[PDB]
Amino acid sequence: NINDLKLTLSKAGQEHLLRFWNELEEAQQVELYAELQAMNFEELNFFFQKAIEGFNVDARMEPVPREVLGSATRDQDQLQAWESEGLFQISQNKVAVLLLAGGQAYPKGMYDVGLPSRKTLFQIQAERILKLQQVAEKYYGNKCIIPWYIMTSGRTMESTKEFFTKHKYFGLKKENVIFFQQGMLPAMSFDGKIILEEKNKVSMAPDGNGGLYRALAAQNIVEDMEQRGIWSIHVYCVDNILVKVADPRFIGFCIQKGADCGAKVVEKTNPTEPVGVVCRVDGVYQVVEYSEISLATAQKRSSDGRLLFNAGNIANHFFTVPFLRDVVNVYEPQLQHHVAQKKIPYVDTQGQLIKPDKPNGIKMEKFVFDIFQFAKKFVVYEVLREDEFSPLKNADSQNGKDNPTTARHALMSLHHCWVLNAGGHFIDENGSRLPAIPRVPIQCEISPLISYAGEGLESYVADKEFHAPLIIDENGVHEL
Amino acid sequence: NINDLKLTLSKAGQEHLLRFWNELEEAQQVELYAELQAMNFEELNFFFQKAIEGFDARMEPVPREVLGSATRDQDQLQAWESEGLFQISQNKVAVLLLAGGQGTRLGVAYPKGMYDVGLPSRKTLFQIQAERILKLQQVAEKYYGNKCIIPWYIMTSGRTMESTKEFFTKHKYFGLKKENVIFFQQGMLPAMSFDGKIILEEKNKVSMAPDGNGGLYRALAAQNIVEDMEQRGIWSIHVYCVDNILVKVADPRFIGFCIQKGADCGAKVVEKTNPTEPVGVVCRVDGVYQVVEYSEISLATAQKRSSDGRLLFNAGNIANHFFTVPFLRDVVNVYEPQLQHHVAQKKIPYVDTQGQLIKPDKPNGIKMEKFVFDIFQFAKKFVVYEVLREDEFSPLKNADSQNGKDNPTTARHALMSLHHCWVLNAGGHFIDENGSRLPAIPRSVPIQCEISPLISYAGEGLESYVADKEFHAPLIIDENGVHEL
Numbered sequence: 027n028i029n030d031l032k033l034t035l036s037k038a039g040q041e042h043l044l045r046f047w048n049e050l051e052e053a054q055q056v057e058l059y060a061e062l063q064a065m066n067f068e069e070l071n072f073f074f075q076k077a078i079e080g081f082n083v084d085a086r087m088e089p090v091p092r093e094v095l096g097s098a099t100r101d102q103d104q105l106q107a108w109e110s111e112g113l114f115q116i117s118q119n120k121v122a123v124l125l126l127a128g129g130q131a132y133p134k135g136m137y138d139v140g141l142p143s144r145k146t147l148f149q150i151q152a153e154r155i156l157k158l159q160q161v162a163e164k165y166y167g168n169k170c171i172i173p174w175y176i177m178t179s180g181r182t183m184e185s186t187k188e189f190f191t192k193h194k195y196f197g198l199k200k201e202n203v204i205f206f207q208q209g210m211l212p213a214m215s216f217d218g219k220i221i222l223e224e225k226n227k228v229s230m231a232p233d234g235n236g237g238l239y240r241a242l243a244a245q246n247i248v249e250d251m252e253q254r255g256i257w258s259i260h261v262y263c264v265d266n267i268l269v270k271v272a273d274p275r276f277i278g279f280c281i282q283k284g285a286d287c288g289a290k291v292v293e294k295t296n297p298t299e300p301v302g303v304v305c306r307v308d309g310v311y312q313v314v315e316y317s318e319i320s321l322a323t324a325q326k327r328s329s330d331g332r333l334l335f336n337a338g339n340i341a342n343h344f345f346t347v348p349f350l351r352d353v354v355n356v357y358e359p360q361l362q363h364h365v366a367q368k369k370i371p372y373v374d375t376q377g378q379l380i381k382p383d384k385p386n387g388i389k390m391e392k393f394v395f396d397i398f399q400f401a402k403k404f405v406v407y408e409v410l411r412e413d414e415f416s417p418l419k420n421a422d423s424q425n426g427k428d429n430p431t432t433a434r435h436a437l438m439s440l441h442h443c444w445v446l447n448a449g450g451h452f453i454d455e456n457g458s459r460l461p462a463i464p465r466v467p468i469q470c471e472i473s474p475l476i477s478y479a480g481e482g483l484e485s486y487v488a489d490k491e492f493h494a495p496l497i498i499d500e501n502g503v504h505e506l
Numbered sequence: 507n508i509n510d511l512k513l514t515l516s517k518a519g520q521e522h523l524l525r526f527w528n529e530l531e532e533a534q535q536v537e538l539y540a541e542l543q544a545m546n547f548e549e550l551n552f553f554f555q556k557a558i559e560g561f562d563a564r565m566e567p568v569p570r571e572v573l574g575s576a577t578r579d580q581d582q583l584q585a586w587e588s589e590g591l592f593q594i595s596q597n598k599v600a601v602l603l604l605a606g607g608q609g610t611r612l613g614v615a616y617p618k619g620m621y622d623v624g625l626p627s628r629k630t631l632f633q634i635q636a637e638r639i640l641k642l643q644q645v646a647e648k649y650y651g652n653k654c655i656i657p658w659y660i661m662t663s664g665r666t667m668e669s670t671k672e673f674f675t676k677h678k679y680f681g682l683k684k685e686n687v688i689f690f691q692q693g694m695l696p697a698m699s700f701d702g703k704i705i706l707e708e709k710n711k712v713s714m715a716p717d718g719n720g721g722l723y724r725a726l727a728a729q730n731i732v733e734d735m736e737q738r739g740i741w742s743i744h745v746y747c748v749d750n751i752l753v754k755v756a757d758p759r760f761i762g763f764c765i766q767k768g769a770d771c772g773a774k775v776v777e778k779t780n781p782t783e784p785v786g787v788v789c790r791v792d793g794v795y796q797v798v799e800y801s802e803i804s805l806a807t808a809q810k811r812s813s814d815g816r817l818l819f820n821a822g823n824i825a826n827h828f829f830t831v832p833f834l835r836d837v838v839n840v841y842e843p844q845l846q847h848h849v850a851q852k853k854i855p856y857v858d859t860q861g862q863l864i865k866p867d868k869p870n871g872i873k874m875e876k877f878v879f880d881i882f883q884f885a886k887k888f889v890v891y892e893v894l895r896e897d898e899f900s901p902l903k904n905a906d907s908q909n910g911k912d913n914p915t916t917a918r919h920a921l922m923s924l925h926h927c928w929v930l931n932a933g934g935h936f937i938d939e940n941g942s943r944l945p946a947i948p949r950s951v952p953i954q955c956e957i958s959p960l961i962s963y964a965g966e967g968l969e970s971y972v973a974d975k976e977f978h979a980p981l982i983i984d985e986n987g988v989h990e991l
């Protein structure tokens with residue numbers, strides 16, 4: 027019935043949600059009905075109650091102990107051993123990857139950064155997956171698979187799926203790319219009243235990348251992982267053009283250390299850089315998001331002169347399947363919602379659409395890294411920024427950096443260095459050799475299919491000079 | 507005597523510079539005649555021979571004994587600062603701005619000093635620098651009680667001299683006295699093709715460009731600038747680059763540090779963390795101190811890391827040096843001639859045989875330049891002072907995220923972010939429209955905060971303005987008070 031909904035709405039004190047029901051057409055009424063039925067108002071009030079209460083952790087924060095910190099630089103003597111371990115896991119079909127792509131206008135993964143090859147982030151990531159499958163198979167002699175779970179939201183589900191089919195899945199098997207949708211949460215005013223965006227539309231938005239755990243349960247994702255025989259899952263953010271998807275070194279490091287949970291970080295050197303920091307609070311590992319840290323804590327220096335909290339989270343995590351299992355149906359409830367005031371477009375009492383110039387409500391979100399505190403063995407792996415982290419944030423968030431152009435330059439500079447490191451050289455139109463840091467930038471792009479992290483370029487560049495822009499793909503060397 | 511000049515040019519292998527003489531009007535030939543007459547072709551050939559002929563592994567980090575750190579040595583900051591302010595109060599400090607470069611890469615035809623990065627107050631780099639000088643004159647007068655002066659020497663080039671002077675006069679020298687601002691122009695060098703021929707830009711014009719910021723030393727001689735410093739009784743000179751919006755002009759800490767260490771030469775640096783960052787690195791070769799420019803370092807060296815995990819060569823030059831007047835006196839009268847030219851291959855526009863203008867597709871010649879830090883090697887006592895990037899270095903080098911970073915946007919955001927931090931550290935707070943307190947690192951305003959140097963030089967003196975208060979950004983704090991835009 028449609029009367030049970032009115033009884034429930036009044037039981038939660040959220041009856042106002044049906045104030046324009048008598049002015050709505052059949053189509054409108056059925057569209058709103060399906061939206062309200064899929065909501066747990068009793069639980070939502072509970073959520074708001076706890077969340078709003080948040081209207082100090084800093085004193086309790088402790089640095090990451092050297093005992094759990096691994097470093098690709100300081101521990102380069104172990105890189106080969108870890109990489110081989112991660113490579114073996116991949117060849118045994120025991121490694122899967124999970125992309126967080128529920129955030130929003132079109133899918134960030136479809137961004138064309140302007141590379142000479144013009145590939146999108148999604149494609150670059152897929153070629154790194156394909157490449158690792160190739161390398162592992164040519165190293166252990168067996169076709170292996172790395173499933174690609176992609177968490178999407180109601181805002182990008184349809185759009186993303188069509189983009190992948192249009193591209194034949196970039197060369198991957200459609201059956202190994204799993205799309206699952208993330209849940210939503212209603213915007214609420216400071217008094218705890220769900221906000222109507224339209225006369226027949228509740229104001230909704232994705233429930234944070236931490237909504238991942240509820241989505242896994244809803245779509246039985248964990249069971250699918252256990253069915254495939256996966257043991258390790260690499261979770262990562264979609265906007266980092268340099269992301270080493272299924273990175274064998276990180277995976278090998280975590281497995282070698284017998285961890286059930288791991289976090290990859292880069293050295294944070296600017297106190298106000300917008301990255302959360304890995305730390306320990308009351309004996310348990312956590313990440314204090316950048317928006318929740320105080321200036322005094324963010325600016326604190328240690329004896330050696332570096333920031334005390336310098337483990338910048340780059341949203342690249344390692345989770346064992348069994349660990350995710352326990353989180354999905356045991357710990358999940360313990361996760362709390364982080365709150366943010368927003369200016370939410372809504373329908374006033376006069377049935378008019380208003381765009382407030384002042385916050386009129388809050389948004390609740392769960393964070394993917396809030397499960398670190400439940401791990402039995404947490405580990406941290408430090409890498410170099412120029413090799414693995416160059417995020418692309420929205421236009422209003424760019425501010426000179428973290429934009430399409432800085433992302434493009436970061437990948438091309440990296441590939442340019444791989445060329446020089448493999449004995450290659452660049453020259454001008456007169457054949458004069460160019461310096462490593464010219465006073466063009468030297469445009470250079472190397473497809474992941476050819477090189478994953480700079481290896482296997484000896485045959486293509488050793489003792490050779492090139493005229494940039496240089497491109498090296500599955501079709502050889504091309505000097506545009 | 508056009509016949510003598512012809513003979514002089516030909517003996518130097520340069521007679522082609524008069525190739526279009528018979529096509530120029532009487533007026534155009536008098537200009538070419540004067541320009542050529544003011545050139546030393548013999549010297550130019552010698553310079554070309556050394557440069558053309560010039561066609562690592564010995565580098566070493568500086569010993570910890572010569573490197574001081576604002577963070578590691580925080581305990582000594584107060585003493586160094588006191589020494590610096592004392593020097594200033596005794597009228598023993600002058601500053602020297604390098605502004606002979608053009609603002610072309612930025613997309614404009616005027617001097618970078620005049621650029622407006624869009625701050626709330628709309629102030630230019632020149633003005634902000636001027637108020638930092640004024641502030642230290644006032645601060646010093648309050649600690650010691652006497653009125654003091656910090657002479658401002660400004661090196662321009664042929665292409666920035668006129669604009670700069672007119673801009674300053676139009677603004678009343680930003681509050682400073684005209685007699686304490688000294689403008690002097692650096693020299694120029696001609697572009698030359700690989701064969702050794704000086705290049706003509708027009709039938710009657712030699713292709714000329716500023717001779718490098720190291721051309722400062724030759725200019726100091728040609729304008730008798732050192733005599734002017736000695737006459738003023740100056741002991742310490744702070745040399746700095748115009749494009750760094752965060753530059754601490756006449757910084758009493760850096761100056762005091764150098765004085766206490768008995769240095770005659772010092773360089774300020776920030777830690778270089780990215781192997782390919784375009785800053786030179788301070789180091790030493792055969793016991794001699796120097797800077798290896800980013801364009802002359804090899805990738806293997808740039809990438810080298812030490813045990814602690816940081817780059818082996820991590821002392822990044824931010825073009826902020828300290829020189830004493832006696833040392834510059836020796837540079838000008840002895841060392842200068844021993845300074846070498848750095849060569850850059852370039853595509854230079856020229857006039858061909860058929861009298862046609864051409865823009866080469868391949869590099870056709872070279873440009874020679876001297877570097878301001880190449881005198882470190884002659885210092886009797888060289889020291890290095892390391893500071894934090896977010897507090898002291900944010901360069902303006904590119905158009906506007908049409909080259910990535912080091913553009914107007916990042917420069918504006920770096921100054922405002924710094925001032926926002928000052929407010930927070932002094933006990934202030936920022937709030938939204940409903941009085942709710944904003945976080946130190948908000949999810950993307952960015953917070954717009956701008957504090958005049960006349961109020962705070964480096965974050966001090968703000969407690970009476972913001973302790974326990976909350977502000978709606980944009981926040982401006984200047985000589986007229988606190989203003990919430």
Ligand SMILES: CC(=O)N[C@H]1[C@@H](OP(=O)(O)OP(=O)(O)OC[C@H]2O[C@@H](n3ccc(=O)[nH]c3=O)[C@H](O)[C@@H]2O)O[C@H](CO)[C@H](O)[C@@H]1O
Pocket residue numbers: 126127128129130177179208232233234235236237262263264265300301302303315316338339340341393394417
């Ligand atoms: C919570 C979190 O991870 N914060 C990290 C993330 O913050 P950010 O504020 O940069 O990003 P964000 O939390 O909005 O989203 C990060 C990733 O999560 C995805 N997403 C976001 C919301 C949602 O409901 N669903 C969803 O799937 C989004 O598509 C992206 O792939 O990145 C920074 C690096 O630049 C850091 O490492 C910050 O610590």
Ligand SMILES: CC(=O)N[C@H]1[C@@H](OP(=O)(O)OP(=O)(O)OC[C@H]2O[C@@H](n3ccc(=O)[nH]c3=O)[C@H](O)[C@@H]2O)O[C@H](CO)[C@H](O)[C@@H]1O
Pocket residue numbers: 604605606607608661663692716717718719720721746747748749784785786799800822823824825877878879901903
């Ligand atoms: C030679 C030198 O200092 N290199 C430094 C300078 O390189 P850059 O290549 O970034 O700059 P640059 O040498 O073109 O000029 C630096 C400063 O010198 C001035 N100038 C330049 C040429 C000239 O003929 N006359 C003149 O006065 C120019 O106006 C600016 O104030 O800045 C970087 C930081 O951003 C570093 O610290 C580099 O090591």
